[PDB]
Amino acid sequence: KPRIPVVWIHGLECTCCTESFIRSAHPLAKDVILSLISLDYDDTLMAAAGTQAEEVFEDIITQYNGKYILAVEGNPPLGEQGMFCISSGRPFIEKLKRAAAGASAIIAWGTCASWGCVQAARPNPTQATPIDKVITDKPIIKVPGCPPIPDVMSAIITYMVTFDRLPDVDRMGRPLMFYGQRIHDKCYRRAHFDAGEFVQSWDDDAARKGYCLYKMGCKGPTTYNACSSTRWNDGVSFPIQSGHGCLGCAENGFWDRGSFYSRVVDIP
């Protein structure tokens, strides 16, 4: 049977979200690409370059018009008429619009595509803009995080392939399965938070016993993600478990919510 065509494009980005995807432990990215989907265009991995890659792009979006999924990593800049991100001599935003127009649905991978991420942090030199502010006529699933958890990315993919539908989402367009609860709602250090047992300076006695990182700036109380349950890199760790507070990386505007080392002010 044919596999569902996917076109994966890249705007302004650091490529953390593609790297995360290839970290997937179950299913392996190899098995996603070979057996679950047809990854038909992806600048990071594809053999073809230049005119040959552009031919693939045109061939796929034409032959599979209305039938492919568009994955987007990064975001388009509006500054300098879009030429802060140039693709085939033209603004990236033109390629994004052309790709989006044929897609059945769009997956906005990562905080870049979802919200803006680091390039959108003050003063936003390029006027980097998240995908849902540019594309307003297509379903967009936001999968935030810098980057999102590898096995969350692959679980969302397998959900879609198995059930033949988009995941149910919250009001912000995030999949409820993995973004429905806060980090602090499933944190293993929550016993310490509720007892007032805090790390006060790095590598103090409290830190050596795994006390809560609230006073070190942890943004877990205001951040929706799966890191405290699913964890990272096939269950190995997550930020807090390795002794750093959550930065809030799955949240819109997290870079400009004050210092990472300032305490969260209005706990929900």
């Binding site: 596999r3 890249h10 980005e13 490529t15 953390c16 790297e19 995360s20 290839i22 970290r23 392996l28 190899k30 690409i33 070979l34 047809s38 992806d42 600048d43 990071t44 991995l45 053999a47 073809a48 370059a49 230049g50 040959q52 890659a53 693939v56 300098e80 008429q81 879009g82 030429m83 802060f84 140039i86 693709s87 085939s88 001599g89 680091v118 390039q119 003063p123 030199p125 390029t126 980057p147 590898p150 300076s201 790095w202 590598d203 830190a207 050596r208 016993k209 795994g210 890191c227 990272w232 890199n233 190995v236 760790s237 997550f238 930020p239 390795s242 002794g243 750093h244 930065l247 210092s259």
Partner: protein, 581 residues
Amino acid sequence: STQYETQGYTINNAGRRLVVDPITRIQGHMRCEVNINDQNVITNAVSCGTMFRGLEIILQGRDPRDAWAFVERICGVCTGVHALASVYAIEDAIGIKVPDNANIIRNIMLATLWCHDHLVHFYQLAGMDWIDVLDALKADPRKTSELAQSLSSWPKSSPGYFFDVQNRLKKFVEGGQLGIFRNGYWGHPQYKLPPEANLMGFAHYLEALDFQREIVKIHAVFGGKNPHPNWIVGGMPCAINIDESGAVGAVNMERLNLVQSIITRTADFINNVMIPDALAIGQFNKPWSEIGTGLSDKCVLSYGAFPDIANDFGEKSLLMPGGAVINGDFNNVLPVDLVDPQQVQEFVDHAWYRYPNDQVGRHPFDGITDPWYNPGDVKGSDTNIQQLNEQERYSWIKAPRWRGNAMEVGPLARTLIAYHKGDAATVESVDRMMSALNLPLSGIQSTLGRILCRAHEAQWAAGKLQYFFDKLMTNLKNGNLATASTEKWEPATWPTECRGVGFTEAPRGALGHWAAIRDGKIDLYQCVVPTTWNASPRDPKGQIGAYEAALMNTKMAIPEQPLEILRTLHSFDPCLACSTH
């Protein structure tokens, strides 16, 4: 059209123009243009970074303790190296000294990244330039097994295995959905491997794609996650507790055991899979020991990395040597000083930036990042470029130079510097490698040599992982557990005005972050990154950078199919998000 002479090259933009945009199987956005003569030989090459985000601007006014997290997001491929450079730079500015275990763990984090990055580059990025994946379909599995077993002790070599991989590829392409293989260069005359070596290489591509996910588990233990682990100014946040109550909340013996397990597996994969495949590519493509030399026989640069004496960044401490060679004089390895305003300078006369005087270079403590998109007299228009104008501004990449010289950075550069400083392990390793291929030492200064040096560095980094792990364990045995210095964590303790430099050797080359702090906030933060060197545009004297030089004089079999251009560019492992930041 114009012609001029620089660095032994004749740059001539007459004749047919070829454009490759996008360059694929790199990180980020790059455009390459070349002119070729009637003999299909490249007479002009133009390197253009086609993205910019402006981290140096974004960092203004932030807390220096936060800077690592912002700059880590310069790049997800070389993830962690910018954080390391950042903490180094802020520690240098403020006068912070970290505990030995934090230095050891940082060295572990860097070595881990070298192993992962180099492995993924070899197979997933560069590999399809050398391996004809569709020709794997024609191999005989038994002869593939015999080939693999002649090159390596790696266990996974049965005829049945190679037949199963071959059938997986057969099924994949049967439906006509060739995915990443679609419209490739398969059958190009420069593909020289026999079908059995193509199948072997393709099997290894798949094995490396699976295996690479394990290596970064070391980053998850010490840094929370990969990509983009966590760090602190003052050391690392991963507090250690081996033998006290609450070790379940810290780096404990079970966590250290996980790290050791990953180290052993990583060394085994690199040594028995990547190393013999690199040598095999060398055996079947020896003419590429004479192509893509560029600046590698002229000017090379390393800052050095892996300080073994905590907080000592001198020559006696750095395990990966620093130095610079110019004028092709490899007998004179010169010392590098990143504070000297006459050494590292960046030029923007051919880049999309404003300077007060674009005819001079600026040291990064005087750096300016003022973006100005002005492509001038292009073929096309400024939102629809058919040809860049390389006589004017043509890239988002600034042009760094060292004492005015254009330099190559990266694994070949480092290897040459270490070799010529007389590092014993490097001399032995390079000599044995070149002997195995029956090539002269000069054969390393080439596209093929960049690839061989990269594999050799992955092997070096895997051995260093064990060395650093053992140093950590020695400290723990001696009751030395400390992972952070916090006496200058609070901004009130810092100098009112200070500046610092953080440097290291990223997978792609020499990395520097220059930071100035004033009144508790970042006043200036300038990055010069390895792909900024290699992918550099021209300077006021018309000197070309490493990519443009390496592409010069290259013969193309089929002008419309840029395989030779891709081979040489991929050999440098371009990171365009890094280059522009």
